[PDB]
């Protein structure tokens, strides 16, 4: 147990846009397995389904493509073809109010799913807490 168990009000029951405050872009994962951010809300690999395995463990995947966000071992982020170990995160709250996205694989180094303000993946190794690229905002579809 490396982490807190403040959990975030959401439920699964509908797809949702991950939306960051740093720079305020979607999450997005391309068909080729790209991970990036876009503002375009009407992109449509932004639509995501997350999921549960356990208590506060979730898978999160483009229903567009049936891709899952998966972070490697070396902290970058890419769309997996089938559910492995690198595609399981750990949801939490944040501030009171945000969701973040610890890698479960690499939870004992604080690794997040974050966005940079120029929309791009930070690395994990390069994300921690107190930063603004790790605070996402799970919007409805």
Not at 27 to 45: A, E, K
Request: proline share 6%; hydrophobic share 30%; net charge neutral.
């Amino acid at each position: 147990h490396h982490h807190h168990f403040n959990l975030p009000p959401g439920n699964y029951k509908k797809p949702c846009l991950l939306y960051c405050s740093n720079g305020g872009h979607f999450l997005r994962i391309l068909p080729d397995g790209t991970v990036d951010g876009t503002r375009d809300r009407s992109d449509q690999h932004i639509q995501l389904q997350l999921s549960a395995e356990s208590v506060g463990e979730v898978y999160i995947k483009s229903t567009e493509t049936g891709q899952y966000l998966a972070m490697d071992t070396d902290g970058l982020l890419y769309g997996s073809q089938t559910p492995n170990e690198e595609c399981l995160f750990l949801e939490r709250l944040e501030e009171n109010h945000y969701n973040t996205y610890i890698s479960k694989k690499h939870a004992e180094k604080n690794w997040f799913v974050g966005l940079k303000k120029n929309g791009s993946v930070k690395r994990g190794p390069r994300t921690h807490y107190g930063q603004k690229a790790i605070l996402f905002l799970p919007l409805p579809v």
